[PDB]
Design an enzyme around this catalytic site. Structure first.
Site, short mmCIF file in Angstrom:
data_model
loop_
_atom_site.label_atom_id
_atom_site.label_comp_id
_atom_site.label_asym_id
_atom_site.label_seq_id
_atom_site.Cartn_x
_atom_site.Cartn_y
_atom_site.Cartn_z
N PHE A 33 48.33 43.49 51.13
CA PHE A 33 47.36 44.44 51.66
C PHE A 33 47.05 44.15 53.12
N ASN A 172 40.06 35.22 43.64
CA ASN A 172 39.30 36.29 44.28
C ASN A 172 37.82 35.96 44.39
OD1 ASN A 172 41.49 38.03 44.76
ND2 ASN A 172 41.37 38.86 42.68
N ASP A 185 37.88 41.10 47.31
CA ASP A 185 38.75 42.19 46.88
C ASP A 185 38.17 43.06 45.77
OD1 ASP A 185 42.26 41.17 47.27
OD2 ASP A 185 40.69 41.68 48.71
C1 LIG Z 1 43.94 39.69 52.65
O1 LIG Z 1 42.56 40.01 52.92
C2 LIG Z 1 41.60 39.30 52.30
C3 LIG Z 1 40.32 39.33 52.85
C4 LIG Z 1 39.28 38.62 52.26
C5 LIG Z 1 37.89 38.65 52.85
C6 LIG Z 1 37.92 38.04 54.24
C7 LIG Z 1 37.83 36.54 54.26
C8 LIG Z 1 38.78 35.61 54.11
C9 LIG Z 1 38.16 34.44 54.23
N1 LIG Z 1 38.63 33.16 54.16
C10 LIG Z 1 39.94 32.79 54.09
O2 LIG Z 1 40.86 33.58 54.08
C11 LIG Z 1 40.20 31.32 54.01
C12 LIG Z 1 39.36 30.35 54.54
C13 LIG Z 1 39.68 29.00 54.42
C14 LIG Z 1 40.86 28.61 53.76
N2 LIG Z 1 41.20 27.31 53.62
C15 LIG Z 1 42.53 26.75 53.89
C16 LIG Z 1 42.69 25.62 52.85
C17 LIG Z 1 44.13 25.08 52.81
N3 LIG Z 1 41.73 24.55 53.15
C18 LIG Z 1 40.34 24.99 52.96
C19 LIG Z 1 39.33 23.90 53.39
C20 LIG Z 1 40.07 26.30 53.72
C21 LIG Z 1 41.69 29.58 53.23
C22 LIG Z 1 41.35 30.91 53.36
N4 LIG Z 1 36.86 34.67 54.44
N5 LIG Z 1 36.63 35.94 54.47
C23 LIG Z 1 39.54 37.89 51.11
C24 LIG Z 1 40.81 37.85 50.56
O3 LIG Z 1 40.99 37.12 49.44
C25 LIG Z 1 41.63 37.77 48.33
C26 LIG Z 1 41.85 38.55 51.14
MG LIG Z 2 46.13 36.49 44.99
#
Ligand SMILES: COc1cc(CCc2cc(NC(=O)c3ccc(N4C[C@@H](C)N[C@@H](C)C4)cc3)[nH]n2)cc(OC)c1
Ligand SMILES: [Mg+2]
Length: 308
Positions: A33, A172, A185
């Site tokens: 997406f 999610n 999501d």
């Molecule tokens: C693809 O559109 C999206 C958007 C959202 C909402 C926007 C959003 C995304 C986030 N956050 C992260 O994406 C994120 C943050 C830290 C991560 N980590 C990396 C990990 C290895 N160490 C950890 C200590 C931290 C890994 C991922 N916030 N809001 C959620 C989502 O979900 C299904 C998909």
């Molecule tokens: Mg997934």
């Protein structure tokens, strides 16, 4: 497919934000997406126009089609209608002009609930091995129940706004720097085409292990079908990011669910909490508890559960 200049994005002065107010950063995650980056927004609150705010900017990909664009718009538009709750990923702003479509959302620094839990698994024997090279402090017995409580209040709110997630899972559910559970999501548009069942996701996860039987056979999604998935989420919580139906293949999962097969209770889990999972995993959709009840019960359990 065509250039964004050739379409008409919805502009909403309440939510619109100038592109020169965003300082893009490192990627956060990719998907079918679209892409999400960490970013810094300057003067988001314009009662404080010299404030910087860490945000997550979601955007389309290079290969994105006209369908993908419409889904991202619909996701943005519906979050507006649903409204704001502490325990969901909220809309903060959007960049619809002078460039590609950006949808600014609340930023969860500690990733999703699955990897969050897996990185806090104690090296005991009641759980599997911590796959993280940066292990964090393990969570208490009340932190886990409180973790489940927050997911319930978010889903309860979504339910009240007539919102059906159709894919409620630990992957999610995102976690902020203050350990707040935020459901993600929930705003995605439902596909008109028939959906595959052996169609792993970008992270390689089968969405059928979270589907209610009626949503699996008759493809009927209700609030109760989300309650089923909440039972599976509960299981993930008290297994600290475990994978549902271990050893059970996809094609055999449809049979055993029909035969009344359920997952065994995780090692470190109270009978009360497992009973809650079973009620969620009721074969009859109208006999499953509502999120209102689930919030009522868990809140009581949190009070009784200990930190020690
Ligand atoms: C693809 O559109 C999206 C958007 C959202 C909402 C926007 C959003 C995304 C986030 N956050 C992260 O994406 C994120 C943050 C830290 C991560 N980590 C990396 C990990 C290895 N160490 C950890 C200590 C931290 C890994 C991922 N916030 N809001 C959620 C989502 O979900 C299904 C998909
Ligand atoms: Mg997934």
């Amino acid at each position: 497919m065509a250039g964004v200049s050739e379409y008409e994005l919805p502009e909403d002065p309440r939510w619109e934000l100038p592109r020169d107010r965003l300082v893009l950063g490192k990627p956060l995650g990719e998907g079918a997406f679209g892409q999400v980056v960490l970013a810094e927004a300057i003067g988001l609150d314009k009662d404080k126009p010299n404030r910087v705010t860490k945000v997550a900017v979601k955007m389309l990909k290079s290969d994105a089609t006209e369908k993908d664009l419409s889904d991202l718009i619909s996701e943005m538009e519906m979050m507006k209608m649903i409204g704001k709750h502490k325990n969901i990923i909220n809309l903060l702003g959007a960049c619809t002009q002078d460039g590609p479509l950006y949808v600014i959302m609340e930023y969860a620094s500690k990733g999703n609930l699955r990897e969050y839990l897996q990185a806090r698994r104690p090296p005991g024997l009641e759980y599997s091995y911590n796959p993280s090279h940066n292990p964090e402090e393990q969570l208490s017995s009340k932190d886990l129940v409180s973790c489940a409580y927050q997911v319930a209040r978010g889903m309860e709110y979504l339910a009240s706004k007539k919102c059906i997630h159709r894919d409620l899972a630990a992957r999610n559910v995102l976690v902020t720097e203050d350990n707040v559970m935020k459901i993600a999501d929930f705003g995605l548009a439902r596909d008109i085409h028939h959906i595959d069942y052996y169609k792993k996701t970008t992270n390689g996860r089968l969405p059928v292990k979270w589907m209610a039987p009626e949503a699996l056979f008759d493809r009927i999604y209700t609030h109760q079908s989300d309650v089923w998935s909440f039972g599976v989420l509960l299981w993930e919580i008290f297994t600290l990011g475990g994978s549902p139906y271990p050893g059970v293949p996809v094609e055999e999962l449809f049979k055993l669910l029909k035969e009344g097969h359920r997952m065994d209770k995780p090692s470190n889990c109270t009978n009360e909490l497992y009973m809650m999972m079973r009620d969620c995993w009721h074969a009859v959709p109208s006999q499953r508890p509502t999120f209102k009840q689930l919030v009522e019960d868990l809140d009581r359990i949190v009070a009784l559960t200990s930190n020690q």
